[PDB]
Amino acid sequence: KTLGEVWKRELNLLDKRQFELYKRTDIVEVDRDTARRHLAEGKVDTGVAVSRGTAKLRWFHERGYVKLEGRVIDLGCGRGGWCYYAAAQKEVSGVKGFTLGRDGHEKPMNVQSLGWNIITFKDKTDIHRLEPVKCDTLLCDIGESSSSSVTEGERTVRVLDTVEKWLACGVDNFCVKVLAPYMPDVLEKLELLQRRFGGTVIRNPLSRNSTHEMYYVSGARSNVTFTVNQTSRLLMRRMRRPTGKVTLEADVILPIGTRSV
Ligand SMILES: Nc1ncnc2c1ncn2[C@@H]1O[C@H](CSCC[C@H](N)C(=O)O)[C@@H](O)[C@H]1O
């Protein structure tokens, strides 16, 4: 019924070539060539990002969508792209990252970009059952794609449900992935959360066309329904007007070393 639900249905109707063409339509992504080469060679002191996540968080941070301050907690940290980005910011005093890191799930990567020493990575952790901890900045980048809109909705509502427990502890800043903001129940939950904690949902330009993911962030306040539909319209336009045109941008390079007393 929602424009996003229509988008999801049409996305699944594309043949293999149509899908490939759509995925490459008017997108922007960082060039990962150097980072991948450095990581494959075991280089840990060149400042490259462990994942594309570093550039995604940088985009939100550099324009005030989320302030990264004090005690940072990263739920579903994976390799740690958000943890390393946060650790390099002067306003951040410490970073605690949690992730599954088992049964195919990405494990934290150990590199020595600026502030690596103030990060505490913990794997074998299901954040849905992790007792909330007090922090100043709450980050969460969880949401597994599914060809089923119903499944994406269920997964998204579960993430928001868990995150609400953490926000209820009192946090100043947050950036939380919302996998399927186009689903009716998710929109309503977001409206309720906004009335309780403020913020709004924003589409990151680095996100792929094949996902409707948006992020619930603390740095702005706007009508959720409007912004989500704005994104649905953009994604539908790209599907109807394929181009396969990709734009590349420089990946993030962080300073290196420890942050000490
Ligand atoms: N219930 C759960 N508990 C902990 N981690 C989970 C989880 N469900 C998914 N994850 C992890 O959440 C991660 C999402 S991808 C996160 C990428 C990260 N922001 C970066 O910048 O590198 C994946 O590693 C996935 O394994």
Swiss-Prot record:
Phosphorylated on serines residues. This phosphorylation may trigger NS5 nuclear localization. The record marks D141 as: Essential for 2'-O-methyltransferase and N-7 methyltransferase activity. It is a peripheral membrane protein. Residues 1-260 form the mRNA cap 0-1 NS5-type MT domain. S-adenosyl-L-methionine binds at S51, G81, W82, T99, L100, D126, I127, I142, Y215. The record marks K56, K177, E213 as: Essential for 2'-O-methyltransferase activity. The active site is at K56 (for 2'-o-mtase activity), D141 (for 2'-o-mtase activity), K177 (for 2'-o-mtase activity), E213 (for 2'-o-mtase activity). Homodimer. Interacts with host STAT2; this interaction prevents the establishment of cellular antiviral state. Interacts with serine protease NS3. Interacts with host TRIM23; this interaction leads to NS5 ubiquitination. It is found in: Host endoplasmic reticulum membrane; Host nucleus. It comes from the Viruses. Replicates the viral (+) and (-) RNA genome, and performs the capping of genomes in the cytoplasm. Besides its role in RNA genome replication, also prevents the establishment of cellular antiviral state by blocking the interferon-alpha/beta (IFN-alpha/beta) signaling pathway. IFN-I induces binding of NS5 to host IFN-activated transcription factor STAT2, preventing its transcriptional activity. This is RNA-directed RNA polymerase NS5. The record marks K8, L11, N12, L14, F19, K23, S145, R208, S210 as: mRNA cap binding. The modification Phosphoserine is found at S51.
